[PDB]
Scaffold this motif. Sequence first.
Motif, PDB file in Angstrom:
ATOM      1  N   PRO A  73       0.812  -1.226   0.000  1.00 17.24           N
ATOM      2  CA  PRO A  73       0.000   0.000   0.000  1.00 17.24           C
ATOM      3  C   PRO A  73       0.843   1.273   0.000  1.00 17.24           C
ATOM      4  CG  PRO A  73      -1.005  -1.689   1.368  1.00 17.24           C
ATOM      5  CD  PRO A  73       0.408  -2.161   1.073  1.00 17.24           C
ATOM      6  N   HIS A  74       0.557   2.176  -0.951  1.00 19.68           N
ATOM      7  CA  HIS A  74       1.169   3.492  -1.016  1.00 19.68           C
ATOM      8  C   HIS A  74       2.624   3.451  -1.504  1.00 19.68           C
ATOM      9  CE1 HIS A  74      -2.581   4.597   0.803  1.00 19.68           C
ATOM     10  NE2 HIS A  74      -2.251   4.061   1.959  1.00 19.68           N
ATOM     11  N   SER A  75       3.072   2.292  -2.017  1.00 18.45           N
ATOM     12  CA  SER A  75       4.451   2.098  -2.465  1.00 18.45           C
ATOM     13  C   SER A  75       4.718   2.715  -3.843  1.00 18.45           C
ATOM     14  CB  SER A  75       4.827   0.634  -2.478  1.00 18.45           C
ATOM     15  OG  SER A  75       4.033  -0.109  -3.408  1.00 18.45           O
ATOM     16  N   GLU A 125     -12.390   4.840   1.801  1.00 17.23           N
ATOM     17  CA  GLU A 125     -11.905   6.179   2.073  1.00 17.23           C
ATOM     18  C   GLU A 125     -10.873   6.158   3.201  1.00 17.23           C
ATOM     19  OE1 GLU A 125     -14.730   9.845   2.393  1.00 17.23           O
ATOM     20  OE2 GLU A 125     -14.324   9.236   4.466  1.00 17.23           O
ATOM     21  N   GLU A 126      -9.831   6.984   3.054  1.00 21.66           N
ATOM     22  CA  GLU A 126      -8.818   7.104   4.092  1.00 21.66           C
ATOM     23  C   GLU A 126      -8.132   8.456   3.967  1.00 21.66           C
ATOM     24  OE1 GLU A 126      -5.712   4.148   1.628  1.00 21.66           O
ATOM     25  OE2 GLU A 126      -5.235   4.809   3.688  1.00 21.66           O
ATOM     26  N   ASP A 127      -7.349   8.835   4.990  1.00 21.75           N
ATOM     27  CA  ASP A 127      -6.753  10.164   5.061  1.00 21.75           C
ATOM     28  C   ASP A 127      -5.750  10.423   3.927  1.00 21.75           C
ATOM     29  OD1 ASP A 127      -6.699  10.969   8.687  1.00 21.75           O
ATOM     30  OD2 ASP A 127      -8.371  10.883   7.267  1.00 21.75           O
ATOM     31  N   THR A 128      -5.092   9.384   3.392  1.00 17.37           N
ATOM     32  CA  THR A 128      -4.165   9.563   2.276  1.00 17.37           C
ATOM     33  C   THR A 128      -4.874  10.051   1.004  1.00 17.37           C
ATOM     34  OG1 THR A 128      -4.357   7.217   1.687  1.00 17.37           O
ATOM     35  CG2 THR A 128      -2.445   7.844   3.048  1.00 17.37           C
ATOM     36  N   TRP A 129      -6.193   9.824   0.865  1.00 18.46           N
ATOM     37  CA  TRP A 129      -6.883  10.206  -0.363  1.00 18.46           C
ATOM     38  C   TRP A 129      -6.804  11.710  -0.576  1.00 18.46           C
ATOM     39  CZ3 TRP A 129     -12.271   7.496  -1.381  1.00 18.46           C
ATOM     40  CH2 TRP A 129     -12.068   6.127  -1.521  1.00 18.46           C
TER      41      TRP A 129
HETATM   42 ZN   LIG Z   1      -3.555   3.787   3.526  1.00 17.88          ZN
END
Ligand SMILES: [Zn+2]
Length: 226
Positions: free
Chosen positions: A9-11, A63-67
């Motif tokens: 994730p997020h890589s 949904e999450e804060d990185t969006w």
């Molecule tokens: Zn995340």
Amino acid sequence: IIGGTESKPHSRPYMAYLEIVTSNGPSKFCGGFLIRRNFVLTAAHCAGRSITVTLGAHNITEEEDTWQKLEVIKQFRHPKYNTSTLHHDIMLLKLKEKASLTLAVGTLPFPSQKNFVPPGRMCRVAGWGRTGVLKPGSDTLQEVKLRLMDPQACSHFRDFDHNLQLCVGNPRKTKSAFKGDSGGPLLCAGVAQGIVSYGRSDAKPPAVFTRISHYRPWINQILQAN
Ligand SMILES: [Zn+2]
Ligand SMILES: O=C(O)c1cc2ccccc2n1Cc1cccc2ccc(F)cc12
């Protein structure tokens, strides 16, 4: 992505999830990548009446804060884009605002060099596209390692051209970019060399990618002037 693995994730913090609106049907989706804080590169065939970009995503259903959900103010298709041949299948999206830089969101830059990539080597592509012919788009970002092929491997695509495009994916394997992966970057030793463009409806590789190298002058032009 067919025959790939779930990305860490997020890589891949430059990856963009595109929702494309048309007047006369439901939403369609593509990939893309952030090249400046207010510009995303994707395929020209992903153009529509309006587009929304989501940066920072892994599982696009949660949904999450990185969006960062970002408005697109204008779409810039390559002026030589042809809908018959699919030559010059490349487009810049200008965002209304600059994205925030975070661990999960950043740009992918080009090296100063504008070198031609010959066949033989392994490259990686990521996307949220379909995982098979009869399979929905992946909820999670997926990725796959693919072989750059000699151009003769793509001859059956009668409008393929070696100088404009890359031929990607060993036909001996099922591994491939597929529908929904359009616009995603092909990275070879960590450098973006192409963009997912098209392939066979039955998902048999290779697939055809837009060769970024041809377009660097164009890309520079739009960035400098907008
Ligand atoms: Zn995340
Ligand atoms: O849904 C899509 O993304 C899509 C819409 C579309 C319109 C015009 C041209 C291409 C298009 N694609 C990509 C695509 C369509 C068919 C087979 C494909 C095989 C492999 C691949 F990498 C990408 C493929």
